[PDB]
Design a protein around this ligand. Structure first.
Ligand SMILES: Cc1cn([C@H]2C[C@H](OP(=O)(O)O)[C@@H](COP(=O)(O)O)O2)c(=O)[nH]c1=O
Ligand SMILES: [Ca+2]
Length: 129
């Protein structure tokens, strides 16, 4: 896979952000993760983490996987990087998302994210507390 430029319109919640992609405003859903909804436990924290991570970055990039690039709701599906650091991975490592929605052919970073999740579990962080 490779990174390509992304243009942030605004953060939405733990695992969605609004990008301008080819001049279209689109919701993008982070691959391989699930954060709580905003009004569930750790939901405000996951939202705040993703929001600061993407807003405070000099640069965000996106990386499509090999399969579907949009879901059945018309959301973009990508890994998102902020100054080179994967948001999807950082959420799982901090126990603010579970690894989830793992579909064959869009699962390149599965093992990387499972490694982070196991460490968040070992440390009993957030969701795993
Ligand atoms: C992350 C992801 C979610 N989805 C779908 C699965 C769920 O559909 P169903 O709604 O039919 O249960 C939904 C979860 O999104 P959210 O976790 O954003 O609510 O989005 C995909 O189709 N592909 C994906 O890669
Ligand atoms: Ca979610």
């Amino acid at each position: 896979l490779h990174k390509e430029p992304a243009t942030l319109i605004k953060a939405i919640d733990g695992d969605t952000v609004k990008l301008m992609y080819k001049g279209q405003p689109m919701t993008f859903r982070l691959l391989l993760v699930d954060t709580p909804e905003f009004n569930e436990k750790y939901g405000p924290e996951a939202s705040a983490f993703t929001k600061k991570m993407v807003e405070n970055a000099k640069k965000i990039e996106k990386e499509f996987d090999k399969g579907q690039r949009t879901d059945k709701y018309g959301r973009g599906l990508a890994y998102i990087y902020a100054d080179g650091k994967m948001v999807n991975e950082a959420l799982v490592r901090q126990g603010l998302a579970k690894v989830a929605y793992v579909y064959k052919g869009n699962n390149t970073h599965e093992q990387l994210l499972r490694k982070a999740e196991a460490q968040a579990k070992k440390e009993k962080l957030n969701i795993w507390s």
